[PDB]
Design an enzyme around this catalytic site. Structure first.
Site, mmCIF file in Angstrom:
data_model
loop_
_atom_site.group_PDB
_atom_site.id
_atom_site.type_symbol
_atom_site.label_atom_id
_atom_site.label_comp_id
_atom_site.label_asym_id
_atom_site.label_seq_id
_atom_site.Cartn_x
_atom_site.Cartn_y
_atom_site.Cartn_z
ATOM 1 C CB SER A 50 -1.275 -0.116 1.116
ATOM 2 O OG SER A 50 -1.762 -0.466 1.194
ATOM 3 C CE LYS A 53 -3.936 1.608 -1.189
ATOM 4 N NZ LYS A 53 -3.801 0.517 -1.364
ATOM 5 C CB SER A 98 -4.707 1.563 3.285
ATOM 6 O OG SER A 98 -4.001 1.490 2.050
ATOM 7 N NE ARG A 226 1.384 -1.518 9.710
ATOM 8 C CZ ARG A 226 0.709 -1.087 8.833
ATOM 9 N NH1 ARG A 226 0.557 -1.673 7.584
ATOM 10 N NH2 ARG A 226 -0.551 -0.801 9.377
HETATM 11 C C1 LIG Z 1 -1.808 -2.486 1.494
HETATM 12 O O1 LIG Z 1 -1.161 -2.421 1.842
HETATM 13 N N1 LIG Z 1 -3.082 -2.759 1.935
HETATM 14 C C2 LIG Z 1 -4.203 -2.559 2.047
HETATM 15 C C3 LIG Z 1 -4.710 -2.261 3.639
HETATM 16 N N2 LIG Z 1 -3.947 -1.511 4.014
HETATM 17 O O2 LIG Z 1 -3.942 -1.857 5.575
HETATM 18 S S1 LIG Z 1 -1.852 -0.339 5.855
HETATM 19 O O3 LIG Z 1 -2.456 0.693 5.192
HETATM 20 O O4 LIG Z 1 -3.164 -0.348 7.384
HETATM 21 O O5 LIG Z 1 -1.296 -1.454 5.995
HETATM 22 C C4 LIG Z 1 -4.851 -3.445 3.869
HETATM 23 C C5 LIG Z 1 -3.054 -4.117 4.347
HETATM 24 C C6 LIG Z 1 -2.922 -4.278 2.086
HETATM 25 C C7 LIG Z 1 -3.231 -5.184 1.895
HETATM 26 N N3 LIG Z 1 -4.017 -6.375 2.378
HETATM 27 O O6 LIG Z 1 -3.883 -5.312 0.514
#
Ligand SMILES: *C(=O)N1C[C@H](NOS(=O)(=O)O)CC[C@H]1C(N)=O
Ligand SMILES: *C(=O)N1C[C@H](NOS(=O)(=O)O)CC[C@H]1C(N)=O
Ligand SMILES: [Cl-]
Lengths: 241, 241
Positions: A50, A53, A98, A226
């Site tokens: 992510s 993005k 996200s 994190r």
């Molecule tokens: C991106 O890494 N993703 C989309 C979403 N973002 O969560 S995070 O920003 O808290 O890590 C969930 C995790 C991940 C995915 N599953 O695609």
């Protein structure tokens, strides 16, 4: 002469306290000096998940796929596991929560040819989009290291990426995570089911500290580590109180 | 039918608890409806004091007096009473610490002819710059009411002021005061030895609330009440937790 990059292994204590392992990379913009607990891992390349993005947003804005940060992307009606995804979004809330389906749609509209050309122009990681046009940052061929994340973020901070200044300002707005009288954080999280990321920067009155961290992350239960571990390093280095 | 402005005098208890008097004005952007504890005072025009740093910044950027938010304006070497003023500043920290000498120099470079023309274009208060071009917002003829502050801020939020989109985006960045997972506040304080101001807005996931407050401020001891009373109103209206 002074060193551009210094290793500080005492930061490992913040990972070991949680039975985990990872790297934090810091860049002091005023001093033009970097610091990390693990020089090798700082330069190893991982799926961006992510954190992609950030470039995806820049490209969508610069190409007009996204008109501005107010344009509404309607929920497609499919109920997904993350409750905050099951609603309409704009660019601000899609980055905040996200929201995968929104960014998959951006990627499809951008298309393979323009996505590849833009990542080449960004010098982004290994510049390799092999895989699915709407998932290559999660399960395809693109790879980026923590130090390469910092190099990209520095260009963004200074409006030096090849896209319009407007696009860069809008994405920096969308990255806003936290602000008070002591600091401003602009950042983005990521998780690829094996590795967790947090990348961004801390703006102070007289300096800016760029950061990029990744860590082994076997389950989503530890996702808050994190930010927590990164902040422990920032507190140790007296960047934040 | 419903009115554009509704009076809610229960907010007076938040002024009364501090033995103070004033007005809070809120505007719900989604509902296109406003709320205040004192409709008369909401329309009473006062000196803007340091809230004028918002239009001053916009004009300085659009004319190139300020090149960008990173340009450093050196301390002129005169020791003033507010210690944070006795140092170098950029646009971000000059707004954060309300550094009058920096903004006085912006105003002199803008000059009276361009300043008057731009305030007319902005529809800003009574548009009157009589006095010195570098102090009229502190001891000259300009006057603006809380509802006029809202009107100006709404144009800024929507990039509808008669300056570039870029200038408006930079000033909105510079207004950033507080941000977390629940809300973002962009705002500016002011104080003229008699009245204290706080004006700006609260960004939520799915709405924006504009606000403008002023209160009687006989001494500087109660300056923290500008934010504290406003936040009590925001809390009562369940805008912030
Ligand atoms: C991106 O890494 N993703 C989309 C979403 N973002 O969560 S995070 O920003 O808290 O890590 C969930 C995790 C991940 C995915 N599953 O695609
Ligand atoms: C602006 O109104 N002023 C500059 C400075 N800012 O204080 S505030 O932002 O906390 O109100 C001091 C007060 C005032 C002034 N003295 O001109
Ligand atoms: Cl911002």
């Amino acid at each position: 002469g002074p060193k551009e990059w210094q290793e500080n292994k005492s930061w490992n204590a913040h990972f070991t306290e949680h039975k985990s392992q990872g790297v934090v990379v810091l860049w002091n913009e005023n001093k033009q000096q970097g610091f990390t607990n693990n020089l090798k891992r700082a330069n190893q390349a991982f799926l961006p998940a992510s954190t992609f993005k950030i470039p995806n947003s820049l490209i969508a804005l610069d190409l007009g796929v996204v008109k501005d940060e107010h344009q509404v992307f309607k929920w497609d009606g499919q109920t997904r596991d993350i409750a905050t995804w099951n609603r309409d979004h704009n660019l601000i809330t899609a980055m905040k929560y996200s929201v995968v389906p929104v960014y998959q749609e951006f990627a499809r509209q951008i298309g393979e040819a323009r996505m590849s050309k833009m990542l080449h122009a960004f010098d982004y990681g290994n510049e390799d989009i092999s895989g699915n046009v709407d998932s290559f940052w999660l399960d395809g061929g693109i790879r980026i290291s923590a130090t390469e994340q910092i190099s990209f973020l520095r260009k963004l901070y200074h409006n030096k990426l090849h896209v319009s200044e407007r696009s860069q300002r809008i994405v920096k707005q969308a990255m806003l995570t936290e602000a008070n009288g002591d600091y401003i954080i602009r950042a983005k999280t990521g998780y690829d089911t094996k590795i967790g990321w947090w990348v961004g920067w801390v703006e102070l009155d007289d300096n800016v500290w760029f950061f990029a961290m990744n860590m082994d992350m076997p389950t989503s239960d530890g996702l808050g580590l994190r930010q927590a571990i990164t902040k422990e390093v920032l507190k140790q280095e007296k960047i934040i109180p």
